[PDB]
Design a protein around this ligand. Structure first.
Ligand code: GTP
Ligand code: GTP
Ligand code: GDP
Ligand code: GDP
Ligand code: MG
Ligand code: MG
Lengths: 91, 440, 71, 427, 440, 436
């Protein structure tokens, strides 16, 4: 935790969604910031602040260690499971 | 030969008649377009369609109805619906602009421009008629075109056609809720118009249908379509004895001579007893004795009232299906001995019974079930004074502060007819109570 | 599939046409066109628990509203 | 087959009216070039209520765009649906309005009344059976309060038997745009109480407040406020445009809400209002919409209803819907709140149900309510008027066009009867 | 023609009836879906289902039962279980909140919110009835709706139906094993109503069925399901002669006139002797003498009170199976030769005998065995007084400090009703004493 | 019909409640998004006790979350099962409390109250038949009941008319390390009794001992401490949610455990707690549950039961089971030590059998007990008001706000009489002659 004291791996992300009441949209694309922390193998995601449309924004998932998809859930997320243009499941 | 004219005036009446005429077509073999399929077995006579339908060569049968309104937006869905080719195009007459909850507008302002074309069409239907019994109008009781145009229609049809058994179906605003605030004004104003010209004006509530469907049908949050469907069955039951033969045929004139003891008490209550779901009809046994008894329960009345308070005056019961007369005579006798059901002391006979040989037709997509037996009872009781007194007070509580009066007196109508309709309502209540106490 | 002669309202390009009946000048002239109009056995209706999408609909029995919710 | 001719005046009323023609167009599926491309024949069934046929399968709205300066007509024309308006209907003056009532009603209004009356009476004779009018304006500016009142006066003098309607933006207590704001309002509502017979009272801070803590938008522009007032603008007239199980035209609402020939000022509203984050958490049915009617959370006028009593209320519903579920619940909200509704009126509520819901919404409704809480608004602006009138603060602008001292105090004697009549029948 | 309606009240009463109507349907040919199967027949028809089932026109048998209870998710077990289409959805009626082991809540606060609907369903079930023998109720003395709503039910059924053979089945609080702390309060309050509105109150204890399941049936850790099948076996034997013919057919009216001598003494002791597991049933012969002996054994009683501390008054023996009268008389004679089995001197006869030809029917998944012959014993001793003196010791121990009394007084009853309920219990012990001492 | 609304106050209500909602979501089968992915139907039959259906197959809880600091319930809304809560229920202030109780009652008197009351109103009324409410909070902080008797005195106006449970975290007996601390212990009480009367007092020191000696977890955080309470909250509501052979809702527990109306003391406990390395070597029988739930070790309140008498015991079990083993628990321990089961109550145990067990486990229980050894819990707080009350030295921070100090001195008078009322029914016997 001294060779990776303040080194964070950051990714862009988005989530697709289905809207019940289609008053302003048909499908939603919510931007996100996947942060991976090397000192503790810990994952944090964030939602950036957008224009006059606001959700409850800010932290989406706290800085904790999300395990895996429900197959073989005993292990945890490492640096090798993170890549660009891929699908990752956070809860 | 045993025919009737059914003019359905009002936005409520055209939608009551939409489900009333779908029951009539499916009761006979007539398709939604009017075609009459050959080599298909149905259960009428051979002149059974002749009560409600005319005969053309090509197999097309047209209903004996005139849909009357002042809003073009509720017949246009009929005029483009599944029943376009059913109705003759000149039957579906329309107005130009809404009557707008105004007795003073459908009776004095728009009605005069269109009542001339209404009665001329009723002449065109009655000329084709040869054995006519009466008139079956469908209307609401507190609207603009169901209460203003209806009065012009009945007053003019009474003087033109003389003495003819013109019975009436109305949707009464009794209970705690209503769809309008000016609606109690329309209620007592059309009561004067239906007091001397009507012959059997049957009242039906809205919350009463709500409670009997929520309980007996086990069905929650109703719309108006299934309310239309139940009224369609309770009129089809009434006119079934004209359309089909039975053990005890009861024509529409037989209703008149004993449902109306005095010429001001012509407001009978209705009730349909086997309002049973598609699951429960497979569970309960359906027999004559236990649905005749279940017809008199206050939780199944078609009017939100309390029949345990007032004492009954006359009851006619109409039976459809596998009904034998001894089972009714056992069912009537076990009801006369019940002490919770009270009659007036003067008439010991009390009951009229008619048995028809035709079980009712269930429509696809409906809520009722294929039952082999049905009971439709028309009760004249002392109880409806409750429904009338809390509408008269409901009017009077408005009339004291002159609310919603300038809309009525501003066109056609003068102010003095408000008090005249109120005192006639009091005279209607008083004469309805003076036939209540026991004679000595 | 024509318009009945009593029909008032709006039909397109009626004002520029002439010499034909109301059922022929309309029939000569949108995909979603509806104007012309061209388990329940595993549960008894006394039930008072919960089923999703079962607090919404009429035109059919309670024992039928759990039919359309499931199916 | 019944129709409503549209009119709009002022700078805000032009933009509110323009946003209203956005809402009608996509609900009736007609593109920026006026050609139908939606998918329902219900959409063109009652298209003649607002639009006119044009050659080539073309639909043109029936509206008259009115102001004094040419700086708003080009802005509306440059808009996304500005093309569909008829250029001959673009009737306007040359000089500026000046934010003054006597400029837009007496001096520069007099050269346009000969133009606006002819173009209205052109559109009132090509139609089949006239029903009523629509006007969008405000009581804070000059041209919206001066010519937006003169237009009301001339039309009733020509069409007395047709139910007039005008949707006005009444002034705001704290959010102030002009310093002559209570001048233009009290003069305008002096006539609007006599010759309208139905009008809806719309504030601007309530529009700000419902857009901030109900809709949850951080920086609301004008356009979303225009869309929100256009949502309740179209829901009044939806019973004319699509069928239902009981309908209610503008004359039906007028007879059956307005109890007395003078009290016809109403509160608007719109039921399914929700943020983008709370859309998945709302069970969109009328048991939450009926509570959305009578709560002050969805009041588009900033006079709270709990300081008054409801005279009459209309709730016009749109969607595939149950009937007692409206009918029993509107009774239950009267029974659970007995002190918020007046006596000498048994049922205080109209229910009207339309078949077709708006685009993307399974179920909606619009609120229309008459309250005695309107007297809070008119007495407050009466107090704001007499704070400056006793000083004779800004009358030097108004008196130059031919207005004497007594024409002002006559308007206030004919305005303080409104708060007097509301208080007289509140208790 | 002869028949009786069964009422099941409480979670105890509902769960008894589920393992009881399981026996009744299997005793006849009735499947869980109501209809008897076309292929395979269980026996002769004889219309023997009429005592408990009603026949419809479609060929469906429907139990004459109402499952009334304030607890929603024990009836919904029936509403989604195997016996789904057997019962009506409106025969099974639920409340919204429990009485929460409060007699006052089941009698006064929640009980009045449902007493109107259950009497309407009892009336409608009994309206199609012709020769109704009486009612059977099933409850427990410890619940809220099993004691409070039961008490209100007898209050209303006494005046609606008059003097009618209203049998009662109940579950006693055991001397030691008890699932509630307020249980002595509920039992002493519902007996205050049972003593005057129940014609016969069968007395059943949990600990004794626990004892005979581990000892006779040889099962370790018995559950409520096993106690449910033992009770339903006896209730079937009580109503055995109503459906199947026998040498001595004994009616429900013949029970009361031969068991209870005075109007407070209607608390018989229940005993089912040939309760035996399958691995030890077919090994030894089961004579009618040794099962008559096993009826008088102290541990085979279903209430925790041995008759050695009391004196028998009247014994009702109900034999089923291949039983001839003559060897019953030998079994009765050899009981009378024992001085340890004490009989009162005012009943020299002592015994009432009923023989039926239909042996008991085994349920799949049950723990009993198929026996050729069986017996049910309905004793009547003064030894039941010590089962109630313990309850008064349990009542007086916590009523004296007014424990849990505000959980009753606040919910619509006064404090004096507790002393009034102990009052009749303070007299019931002396009423059992005055019929015990020898006349000199 | 029967339904509960969860009010969470403080960090403590918010952090315990968030762990509670993820437990119930696992028990009913709800994913973190809010949809149903369960493997049974009884996981859905009574889900109208804690969740509302929103359009789109998205079940949403019925918790309103209350705190006076914005920061705390951003972690709740961004937790593992954190987006399930509807945003309008999340009702925040801008400034909370700190240091002084006297600040706490002379700070935000009525600002956040009416906002919460609107949310509590709409959520309760838009339903069928209210079983009641439940409230999670702790007795501590820079306000104690200072915000409390400020904010809730506006809510207690009509709230004691139906059921209202409260799982309250009582202060621990370790050290005084909040400097000017023993002024918030005295001003805490007031209405500490007559507005819930179903309080499940939960100590954190006892929470660690079950984690150290029973669960044998080497590093127990505050999170797994909140896992133990969440099982108990689920335990006292499982008969209402899941079907059972012997049903027992909240009222049936409340009626059958509260002889006198001033008994807001129910020390909790979860029976089948075993270490991970010892779970494999476990019998998991009906006696095995009973010997643990009645044990002094498995008591989530720092009061040894052998210091007083069990006034009444509840035994809400889960599984396919027996109850007669609990009878031997009196008959051995009661009739021999009559001071461990109150004798003027004949049978001191209510039992319940809910068929559906907790996840993973085959069998479980949930003990709550009204033992009269809880006299000592409001006695450690009693020597912790008297110790520093009389000096009033660092109370110059209090003094600036400084409300009426009769209210300082009447709160413990409404607490020591509660202790006396427990001392009575610990010493009161059947034949009321032999204790005078
Ligand atoms: N059963 C049924 N009743 C309807 C239907 N439509 C309207 N109603 C009844 O009509 C009442 C309101 O209609 P009214 O105001 O009387 O309408 P009207 O009599 O046609 O007169 P107008 O108001 O001018 O349209 C409601 O209370 C309904 O009970 C329907 O489709 N089915
Ligand atoms: N023999 C037997 N007794 C049962 C059974 N179920 C419950 N009991 C008895 O019922 C008592 C528990 O109280 P109940 O009468 O069931 O309470 P309830 O019927 O649910 O009524 P409420 O308390 O108002 O909800 C226990 O003491 C048992 O003796 C059962 O299945 N078989
Ligand atoms: N809904 C909506 N309201 C507006 C818009 N523009 C202005 N307003 C309101 O209208 C007021 C200003 O209009 P006003 O001065 O009366 O225009 P004028 O009459 O032409 O001078 C402001 O207080 C705003 O609240 C708009 O685009 N949409
Ligand atoms: N179990 C548990 N206890 C907590 C937590 N946070 C605080 N506490 C306890 O509560 C006490 C102080 O919390 P408090 O200040 O009252 O939180 P507040 O209610 O937001 O003011 C500490 O002694 C902790 O033991 C938590 O997340 N879990
Ligand atoms: Mg109409
Ligand atoms: Mg129960």
């Amino acid at each position: 935790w001294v060779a990776f004291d303040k080194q964070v791996l950051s990714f862009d992300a988005y989530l697709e969604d289905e809207v019940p009441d289609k008053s302003q949209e048909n499908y939603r694309i919510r931007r996100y910031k996947i942060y991976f922390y090397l000192e503790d193998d810990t994952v944090e995601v964030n939602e950036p602040v957008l224009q006059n449309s606001g959700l409850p924004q800010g932290i989406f998932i706290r800085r904790h260690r999300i395990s895996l998809p429900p197959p073989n859930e005993d292990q945890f997320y490492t640096v090798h499971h993170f890549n660009v243009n891929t699908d990752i499941v956070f809860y | 030969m045993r025919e009737c004219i059914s003019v359905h005036v009002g936005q409520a009446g055209v939608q009551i008649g939409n489900a009333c005429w779908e029951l009539y077509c499916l009761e006979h073999g007539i398709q939604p377009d009017g075609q009459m399929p050959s080599d298909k077995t149905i259960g009428g006579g051979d002149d059974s369609f002749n009560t409600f339908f005319s005969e053309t060569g090509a197999g097309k049968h047209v209903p004996r109805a005139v849909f009357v309104d002042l809003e073009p937006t509720v017949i246009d869905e009929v005029r483009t619906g599944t029943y376009r080719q059913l109705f003759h195009p000149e039957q579906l007459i329309t107005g130009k602009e809404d009557a707008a909850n105004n007795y003073a507008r459908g009776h004095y302002t728009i009605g005069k421009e269109l009542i001339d074309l209404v009665l001329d069409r009723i002449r065109k239907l009655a000329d084709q008629c040869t054995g006519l019994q009466g008139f079956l109008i469908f209307h609401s009781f507190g609207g603009g075109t169901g209460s203003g145009f209806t009065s012009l229609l009945m007053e003019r049809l009474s003087v033109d056609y003389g003495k003819k058994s013109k019975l009436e179906f109305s949707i009464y605003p009794a209970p705690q809720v209503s769809t309008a605030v000016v609606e109690p004004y329309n209620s007592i104003l059309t009561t004067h118009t239906t007091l001397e010209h009507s012959d059997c004006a049957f009242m039906v509530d809205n919350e009463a249908i709500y409670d009997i469907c929520r309980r007996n049908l086990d069905i929650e949050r109703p719309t108006y379509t299934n309310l239309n469907r139940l009224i369609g069955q309770i009129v089809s039951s009434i006119t079934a004895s004209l359309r089909f033969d039975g053990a005890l045929n009861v024509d529409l004139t037989e209703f008149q001579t004993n449902l109306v003891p005095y010429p001001r008490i012509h407001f009978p209550l209705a009730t349909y007893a086997p309002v049973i779901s598609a699951e429960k009809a497979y569970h309960e046994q359906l027999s004559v004795a236990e649905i005749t008894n279940a017809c008199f329960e206050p939780a199944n009345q078609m009017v939100k009232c309390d029949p345990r308070h007032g004492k009954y005056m006359a009851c006619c019961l109409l039976y459809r299906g596998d009904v034998v007369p001894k089972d009714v005579n056992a069912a009537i006798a076990t009801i006369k001995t019940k002490r919770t059901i009270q009659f007036v002391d003067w008439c010991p006979t009390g009951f009229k019974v008619g048995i028809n040989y035709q079980p009712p037709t269930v429509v696809p997509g409906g809520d009722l079930a294929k039952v082999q037996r049905a009971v439709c009872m028309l009760s004249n009781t002392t109880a409806i004074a409750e429904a009338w007194a809390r509408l008269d007070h409901k009017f009077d509580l408005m009339y004291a502060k002159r609310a919603f009066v300038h809309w009525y007196v501003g066109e056609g109508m003068e102010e003095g007819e408000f008090s005249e309709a109120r005192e006639d309502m009091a005279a209607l209540e008083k004469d309805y109570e003076e036939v209540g106490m026991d004679s000595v | 599939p024509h318009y009945i002669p009593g029909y008032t309202g709006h039909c397109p390009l009626l004002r520029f046409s002439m010499g034909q009946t109301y059922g022929q000048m309309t029939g000569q002239l949108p995909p979603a066109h509806r104007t012309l109009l061209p388990l329940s056995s595993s549960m008894v209706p006394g039930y008072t628990g919960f089923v999703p999408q079962a607090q919404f609909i009429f035109a059919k029995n309670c024992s039928q509203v759990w039919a359309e919710a499931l199916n | 087959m019944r129709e409503i001719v549209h009119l709009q005046a002022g700078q805000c009323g032009n933009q509110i009216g323009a946003k209203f023609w956005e809402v009608i167009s996509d609900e009736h599926g007609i593109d920026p070039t006026g050609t139908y491309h939606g998918d329902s024949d219900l959409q063109l069934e009652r298209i003649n209520v607002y639009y006119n046929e044009a050659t080539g399968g073309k639909y043109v709205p029936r509206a008259v765009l009115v102001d004094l300066e040419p700086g708003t007509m080009d802005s509306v024309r440059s808009g996304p649906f500005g093309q569909i308006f008829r250029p001959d209907n673009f009737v306007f003056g040359q000089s500026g309005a000046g934010n003054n009532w006597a400029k837009g009603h007496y001096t520069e209004g007099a050269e346009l009344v000969d133009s606006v009356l002819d173009v209205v009476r052109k559109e009132a004779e090509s139609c089949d059976c006239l029903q009523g009018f629509q006007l969008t304006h405000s009581l804070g500016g000059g041209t919206g309060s001066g010519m937006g009142t003169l237009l009301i006066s001339k039309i009733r003098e020509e069409y007395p038997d047709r139910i007039m309607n005008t949707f006005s933006v009444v002034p705001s207590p704290k959010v102030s745009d002009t310093v002559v704001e209570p001048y233009n309002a009290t003069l305008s509502v002096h006539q609007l109480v006599e010759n309208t017979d139905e009008t809806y009272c719309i504030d601007n801070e309530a529009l700000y407040d419902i857009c901030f803590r109900t809709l949850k938008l951080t920086t609301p522009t004008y356009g979303d406020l225009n869309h929100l007032v256009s949502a309740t603008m179209s829901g009044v007239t939806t019973c004319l445009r699509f069928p239902g199980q009981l309908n209610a035209d503008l004359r039906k609402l007028a007879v059956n809400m307005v109890p007395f020939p003078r009290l016809h000022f109403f509160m608007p509203g719109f039921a399914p209002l929700t943020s983008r984050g709370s859309q998945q958490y709302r069970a969109l049915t009328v048991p939450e919409l009926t509570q959305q009617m009578f709560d002050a959370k969805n009041m588009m006028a900033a006079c709270d209803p709990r300081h008054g009593r409801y005279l009459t209320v209309a709730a016009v519903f749109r969607g595939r819907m149950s009937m007692k579920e409206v009918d029993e619940q509107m009774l239950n909200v009267q029974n659970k709140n007995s002190s918020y509704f007046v006596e000498w009126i048994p049922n205080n509520v109209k229910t009207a149900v339309c078949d077709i819901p708006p685009r993307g919404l399974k179920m909606s409704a619009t609120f229309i309510g008459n309250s005695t809480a309107i007297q809070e608004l008119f007495k407050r602006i009466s107090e704001q008027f007499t704070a400056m009138f006793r000083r004779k603060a800004f009358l030097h602008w108004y008196t130059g066009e031919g207005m004497d001292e007594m024409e002002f105090t006559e308007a206030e004697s004919n305005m303080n009867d409104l708060v007097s009549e509301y208080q007289q029948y509140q208790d």
